[PDB]
Amino acid sequence: MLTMKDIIRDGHPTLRQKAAELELPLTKEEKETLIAMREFLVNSQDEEIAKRYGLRSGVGLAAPQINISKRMIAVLIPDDGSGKSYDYMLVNPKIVSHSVQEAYLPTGEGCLSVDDNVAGLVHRHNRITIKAKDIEGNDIQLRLKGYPAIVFQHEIDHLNGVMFYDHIDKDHPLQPHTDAVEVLE
Ligand SMILES: CCCC[C@H](CN(O)C=O)C(=O)[C@@H](NC(=O)Nc1ccccc1F)C(C)C
Numbered sequence: 001m002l003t004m005k006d007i008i009r010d011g012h013p014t015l016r017q018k019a020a021e022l023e024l025p026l027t028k029e030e031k032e033t034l035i036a037m038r039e040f041l042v043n044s045q046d047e048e049i050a051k052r053y054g055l056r057s058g059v060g061l062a063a064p065q066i067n068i069s070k071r072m073i074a075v076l077i078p079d080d081g082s083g084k085s086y087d088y089m090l091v092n093p094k095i096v097s098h099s100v101q102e103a104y105l106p107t108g109e110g111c112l113s114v115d116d117n118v119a120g121l122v123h124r125h126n127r128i129t130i131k132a133k134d135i136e137g138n139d140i141q142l143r144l145k146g147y148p149a150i151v152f153q154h155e156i157d158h159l160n161g162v163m164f165y166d167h168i169d170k171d172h173p174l175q176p177h178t179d180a181v182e183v184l185e
C-alpha cells in the first residue's frame with residue numbers, strides 16, 4: 001500500500017527529470033506499481049482510509065511522484081455529478097491535440113509532492129485529446145474537456161519534469177488570460 005511516505009517532495013531531482021517511456025507489455029512490477037498508484041487515489045478519497053493513513057486526497061498521481069521515472073499516470077476523478085467520472089491508468093500518455101482556448105481552476109492547483117499551497121492561476125488547454133496505452137498495452141484515446149483535461153495535463157506535466165507552479169505568472173499570479181475559461185472544481 002502506498003502512503004504519503006512514498007510521495008517524494010518538491011526539490012527531489014526525480015520530479016525534474018523527463019520520465020522514460022514504457023516498453024509494452026509492462027513488467028509485472030510495473031503493472032503492480034500502476035495498480036498501487038490508482039489504489040492510493042482510491043484510498044486518499046475514502047474518508048476513513050485517508051484519516052487512518054494520513055492520506056492527502058488526490059485525483060491524479062504520476063509515477064515520478066513515487067520516485068519512479070516512468071511514463072505512467074493514474075487519474076481518479078469522482079462523479080461531480082453530471083454522471084461523468086474518470087478512472088484511468090495510462091501508460092505513455094501523449095497529448096496529440098488540444099484547444100487554443102485555455103482553462104484554469106480559479107483557486108489554482110495543488111500537488112501531493114508540494115506541501116505549501118501555491119497561489120496563482122495555472123492556464124491549461126480547455127480541451128485535449130490524449131493517446132495512451134492501458135495497463136495491458138491496449139490502445140486508449142481520450143477526449144477531455146475542462147476539469148479532467150486540467151487534471152490529465154497536470155499529471156502529464158510530471159512526466160516532463162514540469163510542476164504546476166512553473167505556469168504561474170510571478171507579477172500577476174491571479175490575473176486570468178483573456179478569454180480563458182474558469183473551471184469549477
Ligand atoms: C489538478 C491536479 C491536482 C492533482 C493533485 C495530486 N497531485 O499532486 C498530482 O500530481 C490533487 O489531486 C489535489 N487534490 C484534489 O484535487 N483533491 C480533490 C479534488 C476533487 C475531488 C477529490 C479530491 F480529492 C491535491 C493533492 C492538492
Ligand SMILES: [Zn+2]
Nearest residue numbers: 110111112113
Ligand atoms: Zn502534482
